[PDB]
């Protein structure tokens, strides 16, 4: 019923991003072009980057040391602990930063849809907020398809979609 | 290792038993053999690919 302002939709199964609609000719949910090859592609490259960045560990398995090689044991241990703390740090930091960036990316992407639609509908929108765009004209399925693609050529709609102008 | 030998196949194994090295990191053990992921002390490294799972 609402949008990203309050949360996501469990009725949309085709889209990380998409639209929900109700109109004179229908009701339902659908994904669009900002998911397909955009959020999906950005994320795919990020996922592959994180995976590609690690060097498969074809390295020393471990080493034994003698009684009189305690400094060598400790040097090896320091090296392992050092590299372990560095890689734990880098691995966790990469994940925390990438997770924050990913979630920010996704919030940005849904906002970008909001700005896209606002750019075409504000000229004849009744209300914009809570993830929803209200119109000053009634919509059919053709109205919804144009808004979703970005072909809502508002001058062909804004002439009829003017109830707030008629009332002031 | 005190692990038993059995009829199984893996690309990487640790002293605690064999693992499937499909993920970049592991937190099973610092000593490994074969085509292995990097050992970390982290309990979990789960990366977001998706959206926050918060319904309207």
């Amino acid at each position, epitope marked *: 019923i609402a949008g990203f302002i309050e949360g996501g939709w469990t009725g949309m199964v085709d889209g990380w991003y998409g639209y929900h609609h109700q109109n004179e000719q229908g009701s339902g949910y659908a994904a669009d072009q900002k998911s397909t*090859q955009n959020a999906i592609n950005g994320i795919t490259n990020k996922v592959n980057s994180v995976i*590609e960045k690690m060097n498969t560990q074809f390295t020393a398995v471990g080493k034994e040391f003698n009684k009189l090689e305690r400094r060598m044991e400790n040097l090896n241990k320091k090296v392992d602990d050092g590299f372990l703390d560095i890689w734990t740090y880098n691995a966790e930091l990469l994940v925390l930063l990438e997770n924050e960036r990913t979630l920010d990316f996704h919030d940005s992407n849904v906002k970008n849809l909001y700005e896209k639609v606002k750019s075409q509908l504000k000229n004849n929108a009744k209300e914009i907020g809570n993830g929803c765009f209200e119109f000053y004209h009634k919509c059919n399925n053709e109205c919804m398809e144009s808004v979703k693609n970005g072909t809502y050529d508002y001058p062909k709609y804004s002439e009829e979609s003017k109830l707030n102008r008629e009332k002031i | 290792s005190n692990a038993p030998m059995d009829e199984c196949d893996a690309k990487c194994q640790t002293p605690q038993g064999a693992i499937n090295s499909s993920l970049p990191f592991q937190n099973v053990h610092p000593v490994t053999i074969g085509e292995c992921p990097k050992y970390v002390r982290s309990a979990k490294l789960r990366m977001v690919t998706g959206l926050r799972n918060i319904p309207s």
Partner: antibody
Amino acid sequence: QVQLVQSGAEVKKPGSSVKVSCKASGGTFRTFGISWVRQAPGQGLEWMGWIIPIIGTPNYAQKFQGRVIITADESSNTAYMELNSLKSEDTAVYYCAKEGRALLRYFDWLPLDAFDIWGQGTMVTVS
Amino acid sequence: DIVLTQTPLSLPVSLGDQASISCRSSQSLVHSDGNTYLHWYLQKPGQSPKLLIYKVSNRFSGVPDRFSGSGSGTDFTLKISRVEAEDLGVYFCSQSTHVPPLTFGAGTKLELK
């Protein structure tokens, strides 16, 4: 990654099954898009199914939705399929192919892109 | 359902000749992405159907510059600027805009003189 290697089979009788598999060389198997395609002698190529091995479930070709199991092992870097309830329809060759971008599947209407690597092998005879 | 049919051609060609083949689809190959997902593959007996063209207008890294292509909507073609000894076999069309991919179709067989 640059190469897909696959093996064939001896005569399989109707009522039984055919097992087909391919091993991928190189790295990042887990995010590869591996699909299966078949060709009967004298015929063209048709889809069996599509897997992104560590990302999600397979999507099977409609004529095979009640007939095949297509799976993968991200450890073994191998894609597999088993063709059940064999009716000894023209079989001949099955192929393992890797797509190009191999974008992570969450959405099945995401383009299936190009097949950059297309292996050879898997000659299977049936009764 | 995902069909782009190859026109069969009784067209042996000599070496040095130019040649082209074409396909006709029941539905557009243009995806909502704005891209057209047309690919061309060439199969020789005993061989896998190796990729030659990866975009309607873009020849892949595995093929010489003699191969290219064009088209839009449902109408597509493969163009060969010069037929050489390497060119012999069956060409197929492929659409990657749908879950079931295009049936590759019958294929167009190119013969030499």
